[PDB]
Amino acid sequence: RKMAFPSGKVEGCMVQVTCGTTTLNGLWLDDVVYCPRHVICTSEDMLNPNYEDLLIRKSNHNFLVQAGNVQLRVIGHSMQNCVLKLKVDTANPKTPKYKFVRIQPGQTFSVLACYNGSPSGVYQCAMRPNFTIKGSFLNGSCGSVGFNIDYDCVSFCYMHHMELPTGVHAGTDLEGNFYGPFVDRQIAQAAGTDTTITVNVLAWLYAAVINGDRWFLNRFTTTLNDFNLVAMKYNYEPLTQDHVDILGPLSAQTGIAVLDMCASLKELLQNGMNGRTILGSALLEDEFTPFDVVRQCSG
Amino acid sequence: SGFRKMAFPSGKVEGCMVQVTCGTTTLNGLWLDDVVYCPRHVICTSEDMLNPNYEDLLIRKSNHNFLVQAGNVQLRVIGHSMQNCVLKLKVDTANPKTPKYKFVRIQPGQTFSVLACYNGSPSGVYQCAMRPNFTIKGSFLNGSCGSVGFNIDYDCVSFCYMHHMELPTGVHAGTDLEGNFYGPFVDRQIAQAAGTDTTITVNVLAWLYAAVINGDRWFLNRFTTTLNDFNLVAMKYNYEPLTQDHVDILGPLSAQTGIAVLDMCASLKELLQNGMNGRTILGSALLEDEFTPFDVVRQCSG
Ligand SMILES: *C(=N)[C@H](C[C@@H]1CCNC1=O)NC(=O)[C@@H]1[C@@H]2[C@H](CN1C(=O)[C@@H](NC(=O)C(F)(F)F)C(C)(C)C)C2(C)C
């Protein structure tokens, strides 16, 4: 099934940041708190903000940072793209090993949804090819982060900023650069047409084969270039060299060449599933990555 | 908005997980105060699991045969007792990370989070429900026993499940923290099958309300039905009956959407008799039944 990473290492980094009456969540690592810069905005400000001018008027003593009800004094502030960086007087004793990463469309991560600095729930999702995520976020969730854990290292990849009219969500990496062509202004914005994540569908078919569900395999293969041109006709993402590489381990485990699985997928796309299921499903799953299959099938 | 299968944050439980070893058998334990809880079959060899004499096996053990590891540090066992299918190991150090907690026994249909662990180390968290046939549709591998399921209310962890075994159909079975199995199963390595399962009707309706709150409305219709006439059709399709307490607990979702519970029941009735026409609800091709009304209110309202 779809699992989240254990959230404990991130829970110990969640704080709340307040300007005036505007409050959201921040991320406390060592002696720095990271949060969306629109915390410095009033309601009217958000309709058409001048962030450079709003920050010039701000001082350290205007920022209220709290871990629980314990205040952390801000001793410096700066803006990096769409994130604020607030230096505080206390190094977080629960800081884990960590890094900041910018992920690619199709990569999955866990989200720790927080409100008023208080973790509320954890769920798994993926960066869509149109650079949105199908999240679950209510008022006050901004600053919630998405992450992956490898070994003892937390790779932070997403911070939440906004919800689009179609009910999907958009945000930045931890250097404040939006995923996608979105801006942190309350103005009409729309997600592009989404596509299906082909590398992930393939990983899910490999998973099916590993579990003994393999009726969909044909005795044919294709060329990468031929597969990519046909895939786009069904609103499927084309494969990159990196996609073919990260499928290597699953190809080796099953002995099924990547391009042979591509040929099997193409036949599925052309003829559908004749009232048949794969892993108990009539829909092809596209939010399980090859890493997810390995991690969840090996423990 | 949006709607995801959501688990509780797992940090408070991660701080309680440890490793327990007997001979060559290793699994997970739950360290609360100065006691470690774990499945009793940790004391079994391969031959023992095929036909265990648990009380005899435990009388023949001593404290020092139990190797308990928290992180990289060994804890010294100073006592041990057996409560049903659970072993309690008294250790000489209290867990400083112990949360406020209670042990509860849940009813079928209720949901909970599972923190899957291996060798005392947390691996993943996911949301489950207690099936009507007392199994759970988990994801557990070798070494996962002693993983627990829980809910959190404010700052209090309610432990409701500890993992013990996997049935041949791939569903899972375990105990409450008093060591009593959910369902008619035993901690012995012998073929065991579960009763026939049913769908958790009140949960399906809560999820239909979630789909409406999120703008997925295609399955609604202009009709209503009586509670009894709905239950007749539900039971025909192997769905649980809907009680008046279930109707009441759906009230707040009915109020938010303006859709009476018995109006939604008429839509579910039509879904059961006609199928979904290959359409989806909240991106699902099947009716989801592992969100309670509380789960939906909490995620869609706050
Ligand atoms: C931050 N706590 C929220 C998170 C939102 C609220 C409901 N669900 C979410 O994910 N972010 C905002 O309120 C941001 C903030 C001003 C407006 N905004 C929006 O998300 C708005 N959306 C847009 O303006 C749109 F459509 F362009 F995406 C809103 C209409 C409130 C959903 C700023 C700076 C974008």
Ligand SMILES: *C(=N)[C@H](C[C@@H]1CCNC1=O)NC(=O)[C@@H]1[C@@H]2[C@H](CN1C(=O)[C@@H](NC(=O)C(F)(F)F)C(C)(C)C)C2(C)C
């Ligand atoms: C605990 N570490 C494992 C967890 C298992 C391993 C595979 N997936 C799981 O959830 N539990 C066990 O190994 C228990 C333990 C001996 C046998 N067992 C089983 O789960 C076996 N099942 C059964 O014998 C059956 F059919 F009754 F469910 C197994 C065939 C190994 C899955 C005991 C005492 C039950």
